[PDB]
Amino acid sequence: PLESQYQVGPLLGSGGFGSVYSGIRVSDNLPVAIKHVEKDRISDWGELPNGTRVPMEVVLLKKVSSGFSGVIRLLDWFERPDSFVLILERPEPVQDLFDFITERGALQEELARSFFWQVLEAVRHCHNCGVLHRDIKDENILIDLNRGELKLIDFGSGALLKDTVYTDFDGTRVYSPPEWIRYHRYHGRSAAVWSLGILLYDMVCGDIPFEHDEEIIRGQVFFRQRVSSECQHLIRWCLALRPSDRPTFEEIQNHPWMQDVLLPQETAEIHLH
């Protein structure tokens, strides 16, 4: 019944994640995103609790989509003969963090603090649910412009969280940690923290800190914008070369730069209205 339940609108984007369209749920006019993925291009499968063969992406989304959170929720899904179709929440109006930064340049620290805090809360939620995102970056973060609320997208490179080593990685290279570059090995949480350091730098500097493998491995951070000593410190800690020298999520959120975070609505009033 997919074609009757949803009115399809314009294409929003396409890439390694498939093709995503704007949509409306006909039942109640709820704005949705409709994501199509060809079966040929799915290397990663799992099974539901009740147990049919689905993309791992659906497993992971189902695990994180219970209750409210800073993740774009899976509302429904459908199987077609050559594709899967996912129905996702769609905030309106919305802009991804990559475009937002591209247009406004480097973010004021107050705005970066609010945004970074919300990303931490969302990643914590994922980890709590037993999901590792593995591609945390500006283009996988949506901003609900009216509410000042950030939402994580794209679990297509994600995995079940585990305490043992990962030796596969399909995320974005320039957000990938030095242990991946050097050894093709990482642990979930510490690699996530590295990607968070890259993200935070991107927010306050308006560009990523490392372009080449050699710079990632060297791990020396140069600031191109005026950034507070406390923010520089947090970034440098997240980007520690040794995984065990990086902060835990608790330590990031208890860091002095992260004090007195604005609520999402206040952030929208001050910075987005």
Ligand X SMILES: N[C@H]1CC[C@H](CN2c3ccccc3Oc3ccc(Cl)cc32)CC1
CB of 72 to ligand X, least distance (A): 5
Helix axes 97-104, 188-205, angle to 10 degrees: 30
Q: Cα–Cα distances in Å, from 169 out to 44, 76, 140, 180?
A: 12, 27, 16, 8
Angle at 217 between CA 211 and CA 222, to 5 degrees: 55
Nearer to ligand X, 20 or 161 (CB): 20
Closest residue to ligand X, based on beta-carbon distance: 13
Distance from the first to the final alpha carbon of the chain: 39
CB of 17 to ligand X, least distance (A): 4
User: Is 16 an interacting residue with respect to ligand X (CB under 6 A)?
Assistant: no
21, 23, 34, 35: which one binds ligand X (CB under 6 A): 35
Map the footprint of ligand X across residues 54-113, applying CB under 6 A. 72, 88, 90, 94, 96, 98
| Cross-strand pairs, 45 | 55
Nearer to ligand X, 96 or 179 (CB): 96
Nearer to ligand X, 54 or 88 (CB): 88
Angle at 59 between CA 55 and CA 61, to 5 degrees: 105
Nearer to ligand X, 154 or 179 (CB): 154
Binding window for ligand X (CB under 6 A); candidates: 10-18, 39-47, 75-83, 119-127: 10-18
Among residues 28, 44, 76, 135, which one is catalytic?
135
Residue 144 annotated among the catalytic residues of the structure? no
CB of 90 to ligand X, least distance (A): 4
**Binding residues for ligand X, total number by CB under 6 A:** 15
User: Is 33 an interacting residue with respect to ligand X (CB under 6 A)?
Assistant: yes
Both tokens of 77, joined, read 């899904």
Sign of the torsion formed by the C-alpha atoms of 122, 246, 239 and 187: negative
User: Is 208 an interacting residue with respect to ligand X (CB under 6 A)?
Assistant: no
Binding site as annotated, residues: 12-20, 35, 89, 96
Map the footprint of ligand X across residues 110-139, applying CB under 6 A. 139
CB of 95 to ligand X, least distance (A): 8
User: Is 13 an interacting residue with respect to ligand X (CB under 6 A)?
Assistant: yes
**Footprint of ligand X (CB under 6 A):** 12-13, 17, 20, 33, 35, 72, 88, 90, 94, 96, 98, 139, 153-154
Residue numbers annotated as active site? 135
